[PDB]
């Protein structure tokens, strides 16, 4: 909460519980290279419940 | 012939296999096991 951000993007996506450590910047896999990759550069993070 | 068999040995008798003059498109290795952990040091799967 000590951040000023210009832009914040929140996208949420359903998905199963090892797909979970398959999302993040730079991964592999049938949802990480088909669905949704994220940035190699990625500033910003995931949230799973 | 390596990823569906049915007897992959105990670890203290690690079974190895030689591969060679083919041609490796690994689809099939990634469409053969729900993957678990990908963990590779000196090359990618991206390109491999
Ligand atoms: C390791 O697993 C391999 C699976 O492809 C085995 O290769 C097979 O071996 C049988 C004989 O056991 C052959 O008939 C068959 O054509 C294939 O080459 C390999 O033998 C095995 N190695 C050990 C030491 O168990
Ligand atoms: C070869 O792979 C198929 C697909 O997973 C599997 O159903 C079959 O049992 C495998 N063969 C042997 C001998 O286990």
Redesign the interface.
Known sequence: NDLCFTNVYADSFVIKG?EVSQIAPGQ???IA?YNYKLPDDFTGCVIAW | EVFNATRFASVYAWNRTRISNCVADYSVLYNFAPFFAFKCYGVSPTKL
């Open positions: 090892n592999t896999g049938n290279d």
